[PDB]
Amino acid sequence: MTILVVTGTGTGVGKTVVCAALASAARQAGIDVAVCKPVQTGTARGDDDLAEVGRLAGVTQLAGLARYPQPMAPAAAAEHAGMALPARDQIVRLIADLDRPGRLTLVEGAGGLLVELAEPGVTLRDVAVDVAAAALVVVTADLGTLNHTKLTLEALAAQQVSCAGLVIGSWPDPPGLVAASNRSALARIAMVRAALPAGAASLDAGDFAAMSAAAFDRNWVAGLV
């Protein structure tokens, strides 16, 4: 089994693009890639993180269980619809079924690590434990990332989930004073696996793929499977 949960320090942090960028680099090295997003909120607004990964990295095994119209935490969205979340069992078997020899499976949750994905109080962290996934955590390069990062790293270490490293979801065009010290700081805390250019999400499939193959150590990511 070769599963990696892609969590992050919160929502709107670059987890989806990182999913796409890793997917579209694992491919370039001839790795088969599936992406799972069990619970997707904000559909009335057009949120579809699976589609975005399909467009950007071309992945095709794109799996999901539940979608809620309202753009809030899954449990909030669920209850503003009057309809439960999936069960831990649905989410765990779904992911585990996705796994193939030679295949990288990426799981994006919703928001940060301890967001409730299933009933009762089940998180991406419980999922990772049950599928023996390592975790890749996506972080901003902005004010607050160090605290949010350390706080996520500890919460992972507390259930003995491996961090496979960090990825800056957006790295500034003019690279900034805060951002630069933040990167030096993060780098001393953990292995920073990639830093994605700031506009990577709005590139075209060829752009993105040259971007992605440049973003990651071909050696670390081939060694994932």
Add this chain to the structure above:
Amino acid sequence: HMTILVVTGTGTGVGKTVVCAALASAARQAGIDVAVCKPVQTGTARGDDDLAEVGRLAGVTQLAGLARYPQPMAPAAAAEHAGMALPARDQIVRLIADLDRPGRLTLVEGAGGLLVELAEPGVTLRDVAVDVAAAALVVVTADLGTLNHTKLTLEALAAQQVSCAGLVIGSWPDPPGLVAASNRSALARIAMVRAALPAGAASLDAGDFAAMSAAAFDRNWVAGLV
């Protein structure tokens, strides 16, 4: 014990997706929990997304899928163009068996008609229904040619002892015409017609869709499904 309905059709573009939405809505209004699974979806560059359709029309949130292909082709063809295999038989059967729970109606939509390959190796919605002991609902047109495609699909169900839950006419013309009205009578002679959905139902808003759907099915038959 399981309450899954496979929702199949005589082909692609006959109303399977709108029928799942209408059945789901009618079931929801009867107080039944509904899950909809579409394991494989093609045409994601056309912008095709049936689960999204079902969500908007019927408000179902338990919407499960496994794969999505950009090219508007049969799943196996889409897969081959992309260089990326289809899901696996047991992947589909377990997804579906996991969705299922007591009092819940789980609906499964395939890609195109009954015999389209959805999984490897050479697996169809019919094979899946066998594995899961699901009856199949058959969506038909009202147009010239429906009797043959319909009879042909009903024989394929019977060949593997998958039950027919009945037919639904996915789009009913206004005004009908001589063919449609004749086909409607002729369809009713070979199978129970659970509903005939009015043409253009797919463009209705959720509130309009709900009222149409409550009226399209017999609540007793829907309630009985569970």
Add this chain to the structure above:
Amino acid sequence: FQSHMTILVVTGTGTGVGKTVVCAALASAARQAGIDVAVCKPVQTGTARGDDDLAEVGRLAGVTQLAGLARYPQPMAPAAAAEHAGMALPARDQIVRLIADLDRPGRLTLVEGAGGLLVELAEPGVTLRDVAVDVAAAALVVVTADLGTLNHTKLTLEALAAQQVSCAGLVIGSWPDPPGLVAASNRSALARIAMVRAALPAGAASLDAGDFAAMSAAAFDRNWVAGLVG
């Protein structure tokens, strides 16, 4: 030395798929190999709209040995076209006899269905597939290259096999120029489930007798056509 005719029931995945133009083209390819050809249309509907598949074949292939039986004015399924006209459907026996009367050694006889395989041609629920069992015909099935073709053809093949009516192969009734991606992958997929005997160019039904004749000779494998009757 075949002492009786070879009968092919030419069915389709539906109506409008090119059955008639395929009969016409095979009749033509076979006449050019020295085989005498009869074409039979036991149930013709839509005659009040000018539908006449037998006349179409004579126009295109010059075939003159043309056998019909039932003609209903309304363009609908046989059973409904008959009811509308206050007529009845013919009997199974009348159909089989229409066919058996055409018998000569080494003749190729083509029987064009109305619509696809399981259309009711005689009461009660008698189809072209039961006719084929009665006259020991192999089936030639006409398919499109369009979306939906693989399901419809697999459906048609499986129903044939259920009564042990053997398959003589597939014919694409209209083949586009050039083919897009769906068409090209449909043809490859179709060639994995069965022998694809030919793929008539889009607009074949529209050629001159002389053009149509050239087309039909190029369309089929001559060794297949030649072995049809011996």
Add this chain to the structure above:
Amino acid sequence: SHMTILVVTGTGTGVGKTVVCAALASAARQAGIDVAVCKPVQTGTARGDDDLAEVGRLAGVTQLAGLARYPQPMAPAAAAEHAGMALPARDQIVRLIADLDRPGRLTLVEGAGGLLVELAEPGVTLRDVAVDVAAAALVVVTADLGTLNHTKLTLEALAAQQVSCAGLVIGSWPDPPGLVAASNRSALARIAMVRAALPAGAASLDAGDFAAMSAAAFDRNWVAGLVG
């Protein structure tokens, strides 16, 4: 120590830690409690920031104790680096706090940013200081999207070092709360006690109105019992 000491942390910078110190200081004062407020590490002076100064202005407290002050509104380590300065020593922060020691006193200690922000070398945080001085922790949160994750993360970092949690406070509550805000409050009250939710705009009130808002914001029995 003879004092009771509460560290006031948050899910980040800009959540209302300062105005919650102000508000609790004003509520504690009105209950007859001697209050001191302490800010060991202050950044952002270039922008105009003085959290100690702001507390005096809002609440009227005069026992304010500060130590390190940096110009740039960056994390303390980066702020100090940019200024060519050091971070304070650990025993310094602890001294600053101990020296406020008086029987009967409520001492509030505001962190810089969130809980795991480095205040002293090497990676000494408000959490480590809380243990040093036997302080419970008050957690200031937003009612915005992302709050549930950030507070659970914080709550569990406290428990991991057996730092007692004195409760949550929402730093800014919108009168007419949207759907998310209302949902977020109900969910926060499930995982811990919400001691107060300060009206949005609390920090631009005059002293008299700020005192009356503060006495209303908190349960006076809880406040009075912090020095118990």
